[PDB]
């Protein structure tokens, strides 16, 4: 049976899974969404006249960067309890990754839902980002708004973009980053907790090797790429489990560890699920993770096919959208990017 | 029915296929083997007391290098029509690759045999080298003699070894190499006819990526790794055909194209099959190609198995051995290196 998010406004509890130092936590663990009196409705496919084109964070036009910065600024200025607010959007990751919801709707009211470390990884974050992008566009009346993406598979895209840097006067900035690594600029997609101290050009090569590793050498079929089968009745898969998919365990985990600030009790912000959403770069990193799913399909290699297992297809989550409506979305409905009316600017 | 070499000492014609400028050709096309009144006998597995250990060409001991250089000198000192001679060993490649033989023994006297651009590639060259190696060792009375191999899948092995360099006083030298590329030294396994102009470290990374391309990305099953099916009655597969195996069409082709001297009419020596064996490095490059077959099986991945088709198993060639006897060999019998009494020194 498929994992099924409950009515998240009726059944929710504070996050207490996967957070090593709770009392010192610098972000909230009270991550439950607000109750607005809305009824949960089924997803309808969008009718956008144009496809939203996500842009490499290092190659944005003036308008692209300006719109993104202005939209984040608008999101930061919303009342806290608006489900579209900066903190509300970050809380989503906390609720779904750190034990906010149970499997009550699947007949297991005392087992948590975890969307990480399994085949739910890619489609959950695809939907999370889908609504996040549409919300940001709505706040500034840009109906064709598209997120940037951190193109760390391209040498010039590997340094963290300067649009995220500076100080607090920049909406895209977050003080809770590893200061040493921000100075280095070039992300290590192979990061394991210890700096390599190698030439920048060697780090570029290493990154390219890691992408090849995740998309070709290790991601050889749906199980090894998307991750292990996770269904109603299952307990949360542990971080580091061998069943976690290639990208999630590889380049994805590396970037979070690398950006997270080790002087913080849980390496906030990017260094833990519960706090990652407070860093604007979280979503922009994840936009390229989302792109890895696209690329993996385009390789046209044996085993590079989407999941057809009903227990994956019919899994569902609940999000607030740009109109503050509650929407239930299913895995099966996010496999085709044309139908979601977005894609990625490629060379 | 399997491809079957004829009595090569009775049915043979001057090479005339696959050489664009034959009037200006700098090497001979009279590539037929000598007649010595021998009867063709079947291969018998070797009874060597020790296993020959082929050595990385950039890591040879003084004795290893001195023995190899002295053996090649002995081979060069032999009269041309001795079938162990430098010229005769080179001619083997020309005969089998440029139209020396026909499929007469299979009922197709009007169709040539070609051992390139199909599943015959790996076993033919494994056998060619097997006898070449045992011939060299016999010339200097070294019963455990082993070839070097050009380990261009390891960074320090990527520069062409200094043992091949200098001038014609060195038996391992060949004047007919790309002078620009010899100065660069680091082989480009991705060479496609244009020099890359990138830093050495990047070329090193490129070569490593190329090895994964040939062995993993494109070598996903026996057809894509070994190459297409080729049986009695088939016409010769053209150079560059997409049915050619990953290593043959990839790194293998690249090294030949890169070393071949573009100032020569057919890019002799390494730049055309018919002349490649006049460069001592031809065999040493090919020794690492031979090794790729070993490594490919060791990866222990889906599809990395040997061919079981009888029309491949029972395909055969004829070679002279170190006693100047004529030996018929079959594809099936070269799949196990232990039984051939050689292997490769590994890290």
């Amino acid at each position: 049976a498929p994992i099924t998010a409950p009515d998240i406004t009726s059944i929710c509890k504070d996050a207490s899974s996967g957070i090593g130092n709770q009392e010192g936590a610098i972000r909230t663990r009270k991550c439950c969404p607000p109750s607005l009196g809305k009824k949960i409705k089924d997803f309808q496919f969008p009718n956008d006249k144009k496809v939203r084109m996500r842009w490499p964070a290092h190659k944005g036009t003036k308008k692209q960067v300006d719109d993104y910065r202005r939209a984040i600024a608008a999101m930061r200025a919303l009342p806290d309890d608006d489900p579209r607010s900066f903190v509300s959007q970050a809380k989503i990751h906390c609720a779904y990754c750190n034990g906010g919801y149970t499997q009550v709707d699947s007949g297991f009211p005392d087992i948590d839902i975890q969307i990480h470390n399994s085949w739910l990884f890619f489609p959950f974050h695809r939907w999370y980002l889908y609504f996040y992008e549409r919300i940001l566009g709505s706040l500034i009346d840009e109906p064709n708004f598209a997120l940037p993406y951190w193109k760390w598979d391209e040498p010039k895209g590997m340094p963290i973009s300067n649009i995220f840097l500076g100080d607090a006067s920049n909406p895209l900035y977050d003080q809770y980053r590893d200061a040493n690594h921000i100075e280095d600029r070039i992300v290590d997609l192979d990061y394991d907790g210890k700096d390599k101290d190698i030439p920048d050009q060697q780090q570029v090569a290493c990154n390219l090797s890691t992408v090849y590793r995740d998309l070709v050498r290790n991601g050889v079929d749906p199980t090894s790429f998307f991750g292990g089968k996770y269904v109603a009745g299952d307990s949360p898969v542990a971080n580091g489990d061998p069943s976690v998919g290639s990208v999630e365990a590889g380049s994805h985990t590396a970037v979070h560890r690398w950006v997270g600030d080790p002087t913080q009790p849980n390496n906030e912000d990017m260094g833990n699920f519960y706090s990652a959403g407070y860093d604007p770069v979280f979503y922009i990193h994840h936009a390229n993770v989302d792109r890895m799913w696209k690329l993996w399909k385009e390789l046209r290699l044996p085993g590079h096919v989407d999941i057809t297992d009903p227990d994956w297809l019919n899994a569902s989550y609940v999000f607030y959208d740009e109109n503050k409506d509650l929407v239930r979305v299913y895995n099966k409905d996010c496999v085709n990017l044309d139908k979601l009316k977005y894609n990625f600017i490629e060379n | 029915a399997p491809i079957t070499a004829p009595d090569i000492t009775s049915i043979c014609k001057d090479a005339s296929s696959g050489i664009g400028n034959q009037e200006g050709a700098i090497r001979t096309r009279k590539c037929c083997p000598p007649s010595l009144g021998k009867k063709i006998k079947d291969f018998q597995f070797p009874n060597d007391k020790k296993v020959r250990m082929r050595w990385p060409a950039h890591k040879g001991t003084k004795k290893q290098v001195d023995d190899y250089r002295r053996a090649i000198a002995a081979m060069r000192a032999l009269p041309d029509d001795d079938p162990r001679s430098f010229v005769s060993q080179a001619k083997i490649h020309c005969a089998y690759c440029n139209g020396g033989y026909t499929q007469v023994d299979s009922g197709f006297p009007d169709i040539d045999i070609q051992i390139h651009n199909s599943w015959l590639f790996f076993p033919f060259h494994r056998w060619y080298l097997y006898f070449y190696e045992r011939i060299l060792g016999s010339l200097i009375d070294e019963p455990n003699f082993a070839l070097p191999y050009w380990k261009w899948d390891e960074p320090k092995g990527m520069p062409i070894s200094n043992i091949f360099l200098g001038d014609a006083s060195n038996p391992l030298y060949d004047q007919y190499r790309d002078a620009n590329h010899i100065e660069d030294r680091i082989v480009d396994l991705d060479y496609d006819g244009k020099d890359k102009d990138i830093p050495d470290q990047q070329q090193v990374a490129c070569n490593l990526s190329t090895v994964y391309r040939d062995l993993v990305r494109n070598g996903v099953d026996p057809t894509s790794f070994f190459g297409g099916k080729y049986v009695a009655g088939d016409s010769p597969v053209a150079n560059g055909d997409p049915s050619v195996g990953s290593v043959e069409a990839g790194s293998h082709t690249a090294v030949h194209r890169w070393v071949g001297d573009p100032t020569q009419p057919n890019n002799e020596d390494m730049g055309n099959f018919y002349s490649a064996g006049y460069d001592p490095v031809f065999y040493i490059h090919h020794a690492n190609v031979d090794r790729m077959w070993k490594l490919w099986k060791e990866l222990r991945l889906p599809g990395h198995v040997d061919i079981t088709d009888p029309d491949w198993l029972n395909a055969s060639y004829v070679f002279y051995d170190e006693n100047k006897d004529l030996v018929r060999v079959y594809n099936k019998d070269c799949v196990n290196l232990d039984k051939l009494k050689y292997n490769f020194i590994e890290n």
Binding site: Y212 | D190, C206
Partner: peptide, 9 residues
Amino acid sequence: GVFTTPCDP
């Protein structure tokens, strides 16, 4: 694409 390798300029 599909993705960059060191062989690309």
